[PDB]
Amino acid sequence: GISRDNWHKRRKTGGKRKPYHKKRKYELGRPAANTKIGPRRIHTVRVRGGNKKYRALRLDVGNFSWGSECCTRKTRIIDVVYNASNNELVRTKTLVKNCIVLIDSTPYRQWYESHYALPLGRKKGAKLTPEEEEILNKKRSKKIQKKYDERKKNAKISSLLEEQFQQGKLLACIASRPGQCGRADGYVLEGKELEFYLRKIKARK
Amino acid sequence: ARGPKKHLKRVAAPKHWMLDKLTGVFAPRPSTGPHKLRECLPLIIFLRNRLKYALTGDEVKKICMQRFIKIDGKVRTDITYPAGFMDVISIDKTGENFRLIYDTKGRFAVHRITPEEAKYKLCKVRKIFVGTKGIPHLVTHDARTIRYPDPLIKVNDTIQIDLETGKITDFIKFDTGNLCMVTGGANLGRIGVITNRERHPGSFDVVHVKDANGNSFATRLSNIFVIGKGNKPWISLPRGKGIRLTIAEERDKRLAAKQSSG
Amino acid sequence: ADIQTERAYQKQPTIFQNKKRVLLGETGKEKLPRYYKNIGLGFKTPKEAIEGTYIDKKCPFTGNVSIRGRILSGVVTKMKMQRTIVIRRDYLHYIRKYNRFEKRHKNMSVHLSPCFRDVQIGDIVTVGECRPLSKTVRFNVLKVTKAAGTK
Amino acid sequence: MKLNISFPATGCQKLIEVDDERKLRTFYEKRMATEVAADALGEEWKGYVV
RNA sequence: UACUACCGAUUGGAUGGUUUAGUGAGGCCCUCGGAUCGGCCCCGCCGGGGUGCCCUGGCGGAGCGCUGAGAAGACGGUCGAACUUGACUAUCUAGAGGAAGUA
RNA sequence: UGGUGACUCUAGAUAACCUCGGGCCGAUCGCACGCCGGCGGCGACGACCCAUUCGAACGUCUGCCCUAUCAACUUUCGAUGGUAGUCGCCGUGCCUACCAUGGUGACCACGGGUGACGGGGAAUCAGGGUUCGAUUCCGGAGAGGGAGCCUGAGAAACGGCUACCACAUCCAAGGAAGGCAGCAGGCGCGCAAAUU
RNA sequence: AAACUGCGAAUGGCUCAUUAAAUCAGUUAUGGUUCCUUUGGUCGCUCGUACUUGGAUAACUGUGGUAAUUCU
């Protein structure tokens, strides 16, 4: 019986309307299904026209895109850190649109070394397992080492991202609506937006 | 209402069907189809009210259910099927072919055409879009979509369909100097030559048409159907040539038809 | 500062602004490319629109609205809300029995883009119909002409 | 009680009326779809589980 | 000689409408719940085929095996008729007394 | 590539994702029979998507009777607006969070009344007017009063369901069933209206 | 015949209680939506037992309960 009608509101002058018709079905609202972080649990809503909606009630994974590199990978979701609308959607860890979220970085790390042949997020102890040595220090052809070193002239990240790759957790912002399509998708925060949300998280805590 | 309506009262039926008051409470209520229900002839009205082949709706059911009526080359057993502007109604058993063309008073005439003419029709292109791997599309005024038209065909042009294949043979462009029929409004059923088109952005354009006797009239752009190129129509025209007589000269013609006949 | 006053990061949604680049452009000239469009009814986009730095999602020139419907005009009376003003439209209504007229008026809350700075009261705005932007706001300021005395 | 008793091996049924509460002690406080050895029903009912 | 209408105590009783406070039928959503019903396994009695082993074929048995489906019910949330007690207000009715005018 | 007065349109290119309460990519039916074991002619029922038709729903502008013995109202419990969301078929205070203090009014707001459903129309009429319109066409609303839902393309459906309130039926007293402001008909009400 | 399946039962009919910028009328808009059906398009565009797959359940047969239902 949640409704979205205009006729229960005051007029612009401030006088109250009398209702002339009672609640219709096309003016209905549904409960505000709050997504959490957990193993995947998605319910299905039958909507107007016979179409279909997806209430994600629990998500743990969704794909986020590195905007500068154009690298989109499916990635585990760690934690919610900042919600720009309410602060109580953070202590409850609710996933909605435009919320700031901590994601994994290892699908972006494995793409970065496979494409640019540089270490990223490695410690100064430099303990390297023999798995990634044969992709970081492979034997390769002259024409192919030419291409791999021609890529290395621009393979430079901001310092604000590499300290996140040090901890294995990038910062991302959800761009889709998880109550309406059952997915948590988005993009990795970079640049002015990144330092904006960094000082917001800094001032909030 | 709680949903779509299925009846039509007889007084609220379109005026050009020329139904009368006392034979019933209801009108035939056209089915959904290629033409709008304010702009169509249902097949039951054409077959007993115009052609007088039937005397009831039951006899129209009996005539149509013998698969004797082809509208645009396909058999229609629906008795309220909306036939419309420039559809070819072809009855094979009697050897007749008809095309629905407005009279000078804005009603569909019983226009008989030769079976040479009954293999084509003209359509007005209403929408062009490119869809799903760059295939261009048409949408005509009777809900046909055509893949891969000629790239010179633009919106408001008039193309020619072959009724068996469904493909374009040729087309007319929208330009001043071509011939029209008005398919809407006060000027409905009149025929003349385009002389002008004034473009008002954000609203409807106005097209000025000149009659064969020098009369001139405007319509909107959506009420314009390009018949022919220059002065030659690509179809046969009805009894009046799209020249609306005034009531005085119509009275004079009707009186001159009595002092000579008899 | 000077844009980011809200709790969420304001940006034009159509312009990507984290395109990586080499230091000869990363240090040389720093300019966010601005999105703007041309509304279609002969109205020309102001200079402050295409070069400004404000972020308004309801602006007719740099935001996501379309202008379609009725072109009207009123006179500014109240400038007291955030990015939206109140205009007054005066007209004469014909009473038929007396063959005469009476002065009526109607108010309109209308959205004012930040590209029209130096808008006083008493001057004539041209408004264009858009989609409903608020509970009572349906129009959008398209052109400002000054009052009679402001030289 | 009456006892609508069936036998799905040959599909023949029978209604036996038992007006003796000593026999019905076996079925009390049970549930549906729980098997009970029907020894208390008589003497022909020895190896019978219903 | 009678009517008319008021105040009217009764805070008569009953009913309605606004609100304070308290309660909350029912559906829907959510977190559980798991009465029951299957399948795949594991053995037993064992045919055929291929080769003591495997696939089929019939069962039967048990295993908190491991999964699928799943009703009652309950915590919570929401929508929310109604219920109780107030306050204000209105009406219908039982009601002593009287007054004036009405004739 | 194409279009519009105007796109953040259509089409294209790249990187991925693609919901167990799963998206499409045919395990369906008839008739006539066949041509060189294959290749088949008409239909019927389907089907994601696109377009069309019938709509629907939200908006734009102007327009309504009496009342000031109704002059200030709205804002606690959204009032007016901004930002981000949630929900919705979508636009939007529709709802939430945080901010701003706005919005309407003697050009009559707000409140009340109406023996007020609104129009097309009707009677009267020198010209101007005045009164009526429940009523067969169009639009709205409601099925005793409120409320909540299921199914479905479409309903907050009542010749569907679930409650409460008021009435009311059958009963073996445990329970069960209801909704004529459809057609008839009855009672009542009345000055006032027809055939089970 | 029955029964399962599909569709329709949201139209029509009735009434005028509510309702005073509300309804409604003329005008516009959806570039801000959904749409059974009809009509046209699309339906080897996908590079990865089929000469046909599996479990049920009505109608029917048979045994019943309740004072009582279009109960089961």
From Swiss-Prot, chain A:
Residues 7-25 have a biased composition (Basic residues). It is found in: Cytoplasm; Membrane; Nucleus, Nucleolus. Coiled coil: none annotated. Pfam families: Ribosomal_S8e. It is a lipid-anchor. A lipid is attached at G1 (N-myristoyl glycine). Belongs to the eukaryotic ribosomal protein eS8 family. GO terms for cellular component: cytoplasm; cytosol; cytosolic ribosome; cytosolic small ribosomal subunit; endoplasmic reticulum; extracellular exosome; focal adhesion; membrane. The modification N6-acetyllysine is found at K36, K127. PANTHER family: 40S RIBOSOMAL PROTEIN S8 (PTHR10394). This is Small ribosomal subunit protein eS8. There is a cross-link at K169, K192 (Glycyl lysine isopeptide (Lys-Gly) (interchain with G-Cter in SUMO2)). InterPro entries: Ribosomal_eS8 (IPR001047), Ribosomal_eS8_CS (IPR018283), Ribosomal_protein_eS8_euk (IPR042563), Ribosomal_Se8/biogenesis_NSA2 (IPR022309). Residues 1-26 are annotated as: Disordered. Component of the small ribosomal subunit. Identified in a IGF2BP1-dependent mRNP granule complex containing untranslated mRNAs. Part of the small subunit (SSU) processome, composed of more than 70 proteins and the RNA chaperone small nucleolar RNA (snoRNA) U3.
UniProtKB/Swiss-Prot annotation, chain B:
There is a cross-link at K229 (Glycyl lysine isopeptide (Lys-Gly) (interchain with G-Cter in SUMO2)). InterPro entries: KOW, Rib_uL2_dom2, Ribosomal_eS4, Ribosomal_eS4_C, Ribosomal_eS4_central_region, Ribosomal_eS4_central_sf, Ribosomal_eS4_KOW, Ribosomal_eS4_N. It is found in: Cytoplasm; Nucleus, Nucleolus. Its main location: cytoplasm. One of its GO terms (cellular component) is nucleolus. Keywords: Acetylation, Cytoplasm, Isopeptide bond, Nucleus, Ribonucleoprotein, Ribosomal protein, RNA-binding, rRNA-binding, Ubl conjugation. One of its GO terms (molecular function) is RNA binding. The modification N6-acetyllysine is found at K232. GO terms for biological process: cytoplasmic translation; positive regulation of cell population proliferation; positive regulation of translation; ribosomal small subunit biogenesis; translation. Gene3D superfamilies: 2.30.30.30, 2.40.50.740, RNA-binding S4 domain. Pfam families: 40S_S4_C (PF16121), KOW (PF00467), Ribosomal_S4e (PF00900), RS4NT (PF08071). It comes from the Eukaryota. Residues 41-103 form the S4 RNA-binding domain. Component of the small ribosomal subunit. Part of the small subunit (SSU) processome, composed of more than 70 proteins and the RNA chaperone small nucleolar RNA (snoRNA) U3. Identified in a IGF2BP1-dependent mRNP granule complex containing untranslated mRNAs. Belongs to the eukaryotic ribosomal protein eS4 family. HAMAP family: Ribosomal_eS4. This is Small ribosomal subunit protein eS4, X isoform.
From Swiss-Prot, chain C:
Its main location: cytoplasm. The modification Citrulline is found at R21. The modification N-acetylalanine is found at A1. The modification Omega-N-methylarginine is found at R68. GO terms for cellular component: cytoplasm; cytosol; cytosolic ribosome; cytosolic small ribosomal subunit; extracellular exosome; focal adhesion; membrane; nucleolus. The modification Phosphoserine is found at S66, S109. It is found in: Cytoplasm; Nucleus, Nucleolus. Keywords: Acetylation, Citrullination, Cytoplasm, Lipoprotein, Methylation, Nucleus, Palmitate, Phosphoprotein, Ribonucleoprotein, Ribosomal protein, RNA-binding, rRNA-binding. Citrullinated by PADI4. GO terms for biological process: cytoplasmic translation; ribosomal small subunit biogenesis; translation. It comes from the Eukaryota. Disulfide bonds: none annotated. The modification N6-acetyllysine is found at K37, K44, K57. One of its GO terms (molecular function) is rRNA binding. A lipid is attached at C59 (S-palmitoyl cysteine). Component of the small ribosomal subunit. The ribosome is a large ribonucleoprotein complex responsible for the synthesis of proteins in the cell. Part of the small subunit (SSU) processome, first precursor of the small eukaryotic ribosomal subunit. During the assembly of the SSU processome in the nucleolus, many ribosome biogenesis factors, an RNA chaperone and ribosomal proteins associate with the nascent pre-rRNA and work in concert to generate RNA folding, modifications, rearrangements and cleavage as well as targeted degradation of pre-ribosomal RNA by the RNA exosome. Belongs to the universal ribosomal protein uS17 family. This is Small ribosomal subunit protein uS17. It comes from Homo sapiens (Human). The gene is RPS11.
Swiss-Prot record, chain D:
Ribosomal protein S6 is the major substrate of protein kinases in eukaryote ribosomes. The phosphorylation is stimulated by growth factors, tumor promoting agents, and mitogens. It is dephosphorylated at growth arrest. Mono-ADP-ribosylation at Glu-35 by PARP16 inhibits polysome assembly and mRNA loading, thereby inhibiting protein translation. It comes from the Eukaryota. Disulfide bonds: none annotated. The modification ADP-ribosyl glutamic acid is found at E35. Component of the small ribosomal subunit. Part of the small subunit (SSU) processome, composed of more than 70 proteins and the RNA chaperone small nucleolar RNA (snoRNA) U3. Belongs to the eukaryotic ribosomal protein eS6 family. This is Small ribosomal subunit protein eS6. The gene is RPS6. The chain holds residues 1 to 50 of 249 of the full protein.
